Amino acid sequence: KMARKDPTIEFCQLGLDTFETKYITMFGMLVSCSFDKPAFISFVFSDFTKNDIVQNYLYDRYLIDYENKLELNEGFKAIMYKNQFETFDSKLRKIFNNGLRDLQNGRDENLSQYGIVCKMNIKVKMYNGKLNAIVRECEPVPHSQISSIASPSQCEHLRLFYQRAFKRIGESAISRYFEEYRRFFPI
DNA sequence: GTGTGGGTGTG
């Protein structure tokens, strides 16, 4: 028919299926990006839980440390038509006065030292057998908006994410850009 | 339940 709502899950809270398909909201921190493709700006987010779907390589979002990597069950790829990306970057330009392009140093496009935790509704489906997830929205969820974008359960889940990254992302890395990562928090 | 999955590494 023509009437559905927007559910929410997180890798482990998935539920898709081969012939299936649906919409879901994943919360996580951006770690990489690829605006070179003329079809969109490939993005790789990350958070807690563990993906159980087959998905694809999902790269490894080489954390700030280019020494080791992580599994493809912790991060995932996110995309959105450049127009959808502009609308998304616009939400960020208000928290950074600039677009993602203004965030990167001007060379590569992957970002994993700012965090930029945000929520986004994505449309998932099996592309030949893999989970093809796109991004329908892209609202930023730093700190002055989290309590205005989430609250019921999703709020603590978001708070629990910052606790993990603090010890998982590597305490030595936060020292390389402590001020850039602390955004507006007392580290 | 839409299209924009590329990769797969790591910068």
Swiss-Prot record:
The gene is CDC13. This is Cell division control protein 13. Single-stranded telomeric DNA-binding protein that regulates telomere replication. Has a role in both positive and negative regulation. Promotes [TG(1-3)] strand lengthening via interaction with EST1. Promotes [C(1-3)A] strand re-synthesis by DNA polymerase alpha via interaction with POL1. Negatively regulates telomere elongation of the G strand via binding with STN1 thereby inhibiting telomerase activity. The chain holds residues 500 to 686 of 924 of the full protein. Residues 1-187 bind DNA. Changing residue 24 to V: Increase in length of X' and Y' telomeres. Disrupts interaction with POL1 but not FUN12. Interacts with POL1, EST1, FUN12, STM1, STN1 and TEN1. Present with 319 molecules/cell in log phase SD medium. It comes from Saccharomyces cerevisiae (strain ATCC 204508 / S288c). Coiled coil: none annotated. It is found in: Chromosome, Telomere. Disulfide bonds: none annotated.
